[PDB]
Design a protein around this ligand. Sequence first.
Ligand code: HAS
Ligand code: HEM
Ligand code: CUA
Lengths: 552, 33, 166
Amino acid sequence: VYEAYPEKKATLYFLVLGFLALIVGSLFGPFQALNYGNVDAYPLLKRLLPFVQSYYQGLTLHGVLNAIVFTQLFAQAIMVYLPARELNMRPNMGLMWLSWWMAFIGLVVAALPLLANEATVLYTFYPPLKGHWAFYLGASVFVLSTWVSIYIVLDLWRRWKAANPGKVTPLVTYMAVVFWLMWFLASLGLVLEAVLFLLPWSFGLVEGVDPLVARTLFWWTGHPIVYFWLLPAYAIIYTILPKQAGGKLVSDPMARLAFLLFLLLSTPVGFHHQFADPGIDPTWKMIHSVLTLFVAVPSLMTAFTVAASLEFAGRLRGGRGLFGWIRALPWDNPAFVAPVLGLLGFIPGGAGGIVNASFTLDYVVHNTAWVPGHFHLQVASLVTLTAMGSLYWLLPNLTGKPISDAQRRLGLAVVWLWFLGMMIMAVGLHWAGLLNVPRRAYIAQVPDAYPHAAVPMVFNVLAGIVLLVALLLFIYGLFSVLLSRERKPELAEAPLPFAEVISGPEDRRLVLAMDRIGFWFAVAAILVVLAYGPTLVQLFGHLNPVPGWRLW
Amino acid sequence: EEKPKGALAVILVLTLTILVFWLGVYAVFFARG
Amino acid sequence: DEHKAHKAILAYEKGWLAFSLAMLFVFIALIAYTLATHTAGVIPAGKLERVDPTTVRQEGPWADPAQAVVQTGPNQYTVYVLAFAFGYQPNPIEVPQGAEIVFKITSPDVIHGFHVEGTNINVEVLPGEVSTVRYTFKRPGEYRIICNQYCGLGHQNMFGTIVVKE
Ligand code: HAS
Ligand code: HEM
Ligand code: CUA
């Protein structure tokens, strides 16, 4: 297990590191949900943890830990370990263990300041909000790690391409390749935003940073970063769920095309986060809008490919008429159950995002509690649930520890609660957003400030209780899996459960074209030079740096 | 065997849910106009 | 079977595609609809219009708050607003009804939000830059301004007031 696949170990450390992160970050959730239901439990939390000074220090850890530390680590686990196991190759271990220590040292470096109240700036850290230099230095190093993650997978692909000239990229690899490439293009904004401004700014080397340029450059990454969260799930959903589900991936090509399209349209769409900004041309915003409705196509595609697969998996295990196939599925199965539930809520999640996309409509919901509503369905439901369920096949595979009857049932427990709780919370937040309730606010410290929002508050609070149990149950579940001296090697070498693929004759021509990865990559690059170049050049001509503020 | 009526339901629940959300807001949009 | 089922999958994969595209295009047609009417005002101006955050409230159109409102057109009034750590100026903002109001907003500290409850006005305010938005108030009375971009510990507590005179 460890010594002809030590990748299993390096992979396992990305998980623990990540799951300890999701646990710590998550603690603040239940609180913030009640906070949105008009209850102040923060003296209660302040008495659990002496170091918390404000709602906002807590929302910062929560944003950062969960959405930045958890998700990247999961990404690293999945989008490196999966391709390696399909190809039956080892990554450069020297390089792989460098990526780990960089994600650990960046994490640590950043935390010290975060936990000391020197970076209460949210996971977006918009200037002139000026946090401690080690939080910028820490996050940068934390991100940069992913650059080794790109390289490593590119290497494995160079290696397999060579042993096999002419041959088509295997599916998971194909996916991991466009994924890491797309993520390299993404990360250019944030790195430039770090290298050119943030880092000098807090190092004392300049007294000021441009708010518009800073956010424009940040949103170059902060959109594709969410796809950088999703694909590792889509990867699993496409090539492993359908096995767990009792059937097959119905289309190899469609899954590549899906991901291709992500490589193309994930990065040039950032002014969707800036509809509400000055100094960016109305023409460009609409352009960025059309392209955003475009990046929604892959997922619309994904809905169909995936649905079919489950219908056929449920057909295979004797599923009946219009809906019969749904019952026939293995509902006893945490690995099956967790992302299928996530996928139900991904429906609404998406249908929100598209409202969000459509320029003029974004002035109804922008910075309300509706964006939270939205993204929780997305990253704290689907990505996280896919993550959660996946321990039930991935963790046995890493360590060789099997899952008992009860730990499974404890998991089923967690996932049905998490999902329901996430559903519920989405009603509240969406509802609250339409009633103009802003986000990122300590609203329970102004009790008579949203009196027309009485009801959705109930839901928030209710989701807060449910999801507190959800998380506690999970922490217990997780650690029982991790701290049992229960071990067998034979199922730890037992292969990952990859699905077989349905593949037609027409594939050939289509799949060969999508393999022209250098070309597709070049286009993606051009798409970003076209979509951001004009606007960036403008800004870089008329730079108005303003001093930093500390307001916590 | 035959036509993926299950998938065709799902893409139909998706389609119904996109419209509700979108038109639901477009309506609100003009109302706050 | 099996191959028999890949064909008919792919067709409807194309078909679902066809549909979703049209549907997505109609959205695009309805959006550039809103863009051709009056409601398009709430879109910030694109033109860069730079100011200095450390002087904005001692010299120029944001220093005296009683200067805020100016007849700038035959039915057009410009209102210079300052969003700042935990409030708005003037407080309240007083604007006449039915008139086109051209809000010019900025900040002397960090980013704030300018979200006028009841309306489509929802513009980010940025130190160093000027958010130009326009809007015609149709129903009179008090409107409440909400800062919806975290600004520091007093964020939750940063409200203003628009007063639209009949
Ligand atoms: C990881 C999580 C992320 C995903 C994924 C995501 C999806 C989208 N979003 Fe979003 N979003 C926006 C647009 C979209 C669009 C167009 C999509 C699309 O990618 C959506 C594609 C999804 C679909 C088209 C639905 C497909 C459904 C499927 C695949 C499930 C079907 C289920 C089946 C088949 C199972 C059935 C099985 C059975 C057994 C029944 C916009 C604007 O365009 C804003 C700015 C709003 C503002 O003012 O800030 C925004 C705001 C956010 C923020 C806030 C950032 C901040 O703090 O400021 C985050 C974190 C976020 C994350 C995510 N978002 N989003
Ligand atoms: C225990 C379940 C969770 C609960 C009850 C919860 C609660 C909340 C609430 C109520 C908000 C809105 C707070 C506000 O706007 O002031 C929020 C924000 C947020 N949540 Fe969660 N959360 C949970 C788990 C997660 C997870 C696992 C992730 C990431 C994968 C996540 C990602 C985020 C992000 C990115 C924000 C935005 C914070 C910001 O604006 O800086 N949440 N959370
Ligand atoms: Cu100013 Cu929130």
